[PDB]
Amino acid sequence: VPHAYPEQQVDLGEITMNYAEAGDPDRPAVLLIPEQTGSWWSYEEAMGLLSEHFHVYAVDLRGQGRSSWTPKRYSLDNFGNDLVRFIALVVKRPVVVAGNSSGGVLAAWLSAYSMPGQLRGVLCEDPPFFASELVPAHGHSVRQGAGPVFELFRTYLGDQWSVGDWEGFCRAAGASASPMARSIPQHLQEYDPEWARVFYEGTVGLSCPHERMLGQVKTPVLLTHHMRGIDPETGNLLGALSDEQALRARRLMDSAGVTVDYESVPDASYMMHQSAPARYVEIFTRWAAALA
Amino acid sequence: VHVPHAYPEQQVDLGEITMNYAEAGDPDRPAVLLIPEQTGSWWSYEEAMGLLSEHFHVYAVDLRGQGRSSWTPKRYSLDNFGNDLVRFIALVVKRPVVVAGNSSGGVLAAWLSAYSMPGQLRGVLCEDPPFFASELVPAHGHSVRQGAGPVFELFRTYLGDQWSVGDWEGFCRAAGIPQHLQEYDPEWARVFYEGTVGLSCPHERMLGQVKTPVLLTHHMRGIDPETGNLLGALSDEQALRARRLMDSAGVTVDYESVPDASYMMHQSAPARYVEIFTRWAAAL
């Protein structure tokens, strides 16, 4: 469907990346990475506010939105290298990156693994550090967090919506123990459920353990930690990451020799840029103002 | 590398493997089967067998890949360990048995409780069992990489499958050869570290299907502040979720927390170990 901004596409080589652009093209460039199942327009309201001071890019990752679906090719390194090419081909200037949930993991990915100087700093909006990994070095695994949702996506929707049993997913999700599962939406119609597979099966980040990535960040990192808790019935993690996982992540990025700003907001939803955009933008603008 | 012991050793052909074991007590007494911990031979129970033999017909066994039992490359799995013990109970014991297992042996004790042949078991004691903690993809709590993983990686890297590397010098640096380790096939550590030993045997299905009374002794455990890793066999969270699953299976789950005992209480504190065993064993 159409949205608040016109959409553009760029050939990154393997894929075509769809994205939207806002703000004076001379202002400092900002790159927004949506969450899993989220398209670029997940940031729609935030872009308008950020466009007052920033040149904002919001992108569809591969397997999402209008960007190419790439069966068997979904990995953190392929996601991140797509963004490396986007920065080098479209933006052509240093960027401040803001990523939400899985996008926040990719924001840290770029801070550590981008090409030199591509980034001035990254905002990781409620990122599932460790919690999104099958075998994390610290704390809950994906199977004890969002995994239950990813499983239902894998089984009832299938790669490239090959199954497409929406009713079956809703039933299983309503009977789930995961409140995120209990939580076709437009953003889901544009979503390649093989995303969920690689996360559930542990292949998306097999060659990209978070401990090595976080210990190699090279830019200032603003880490916002939203709602989190423990489910009594299952013991599973609620929210993006646990307090322990945030602690270990911070000590890793601190050891990397960068400035780590930890902004805990335990009463915010995991998509603050959508639920409380003014608060999200103020948090981002204040931190992004002191970078370079 | 094997040395003589205070008990005569016997061997039985289970089919794929030959299992070495030791026997103590009177055949008139209730039969008992002791499963050693990882890297432990049957004579890990030498101290406890003396006391238990007074009122029990005790059997202590070497699992495959340990002691004088067959080393089976590429065959180390919970189901293979457990069915080896099913065959030992059927061929050697030939009566109902109360099982006791330490650490990995404790996981195999819970295995028999759920997956043995009908009527083979009267009850199982899981001595400090790493429920979930020994898995690579546990349903609850720390994974093996956040607990005993680092030690398993050292066995895998410097000792190697069937001691194929045998870099004891490098192992100590990374961390003589203890007797129990000389009789130990380090491919044990690989299958645990790599998550293959229990791939077809997730603990939550195992624990949710136990069919006998279960005594769970939880020994020393904690968290390393520097890494957040698990110390001990399993965490309080994992012990809770294990008991909830076993309780749902419809069995009497007895739980004794001994926070000041080593993981091998039957060797470090045999009298205390036998005391907890005979007490619970007498109520079966």
Place this chain on the structure above:
Amino acid sequence: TSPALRDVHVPHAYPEQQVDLGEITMNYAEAGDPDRPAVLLIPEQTGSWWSYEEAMGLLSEHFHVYAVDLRGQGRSSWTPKRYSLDNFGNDLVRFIALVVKRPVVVAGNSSGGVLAAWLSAYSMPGQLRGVLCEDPPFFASELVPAHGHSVRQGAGPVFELFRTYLGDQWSVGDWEGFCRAAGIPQHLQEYDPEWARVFYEGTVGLSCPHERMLGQVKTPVLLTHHMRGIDPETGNLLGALSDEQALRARRLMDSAGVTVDYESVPDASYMMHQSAPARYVEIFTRWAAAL
């Protein structure tokens, strides 16, 4: 038709019995005189005990025949997350020890023949006199075999459709999608499609490499090699196992020290006991009587 509800079973020529093997209940049928040499029949994947229905009537002249439903099939227990060659084989080990209670000659078709070989090498001592592996996918059913085609280049493509469109315990049951990607055959209605997952994902035999199994067989083995070929469009294996895989399986079994009989029937379907029962039972009885 709803296989997920397990209300699909139909009557057959022989009465069905059930036994508690501990973890599972195993459904089976029985034919012949108990005083005769016992025979155990293992169906192919997607096949229930009654896959041998006709062959049972013929074999009952000479033998005491047991035909079993493996777990995940027929009326036997469905065990999510538990489907593995070692669990399949130890189910049969217990079936022999609890029900048959006598030495047996085992015949297994397709994956059942892999299990027949499994028993030859990994059963309890004296349980088996010999095994007939009817068109077994030696190596070809493994994700990472030591020889020749992998499962992804054989039955894998079919297993993938079973996994995706039927799903574990028929939880998806998208028969329309399956047909498009490719009513329900009765045998498939009795089939737990998690069978296909563990074969496609290579977890069924991870801890049971066929090379080590075949090299440790301890009974005479008869290996019938039915139709096989190469699909021109993909190069995939047609049939159970290639000639290269059969050759390597024979030398492994020969190295183990057992009497190997290789019976090539290249013009037979993979279910000869069902398509050509007389020929199948002829091959069985001739070989079984010479044990």
Place this chain on the structure above:
Amino acid sequence: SPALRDVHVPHAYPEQQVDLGEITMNYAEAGDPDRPAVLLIPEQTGSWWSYEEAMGLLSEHFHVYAVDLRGQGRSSWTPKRYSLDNFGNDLVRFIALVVKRPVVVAGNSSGGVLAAWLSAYSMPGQLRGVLCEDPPFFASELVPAHGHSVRQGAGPVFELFRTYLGDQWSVGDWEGFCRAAGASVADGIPQHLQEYDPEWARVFYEGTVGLSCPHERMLGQVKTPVLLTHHMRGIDPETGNLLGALSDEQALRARRLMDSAGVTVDYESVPDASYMMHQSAPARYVEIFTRWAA
């Protein structure tokens, strides 16, 4: 000691380095910078100077770049990060940052697998065409869509690298490697192997290097002309294992996929050449290259 990475020696050409972001890539350069650019990707265990002799000849016609991949030579060792996508994207950044011109990519062994990686997955316009010198298409995968798997070919070697050399030479038990190698080298610890991170072998043996990069999808999405040179290959009668880089079946299926992609696929069989023809027969290798490259 290789674990300390204190093993490197001088070579015929000066060595340069570029920061690619995650890693620093060491490379050597030759030829007139005005001539068409060429990028040489060494084999597994091979450093840029595996092409030393070939560089002298190619430098007469092309602007040649020879690179040390990550985990090899003087480039960064990246524990737990070895994958085809990371190898390939390193080369994408190398072309973008250093060459800044379209390149013809020649790769040997795993390097040839990475050459096809770039043909399909590089940035638009980065490549003119690729030469895959005896590439283990499918044969280097753990779960290939066609033919032998790595466990049936070079797998046994990688297994020995993993067990006796270990990640980052952490084991450094070359003594045991020789023992085990003689029961599964011939010139002492080869210098190229002392510069090599054996975690390379682990990710290939364990099937993680290409878990997210199946060759079927890669070869089916090549976007440049491809020359596939096929050297010695056969079957060991005793074990049925694959000798060489890839079987004729795997070469056929690879060329069918690449043809479906719509590119020009050239296939040259050299059944008498070693897999490192660029090193064992530099003149013969450069003849094949120059003839096709023009």
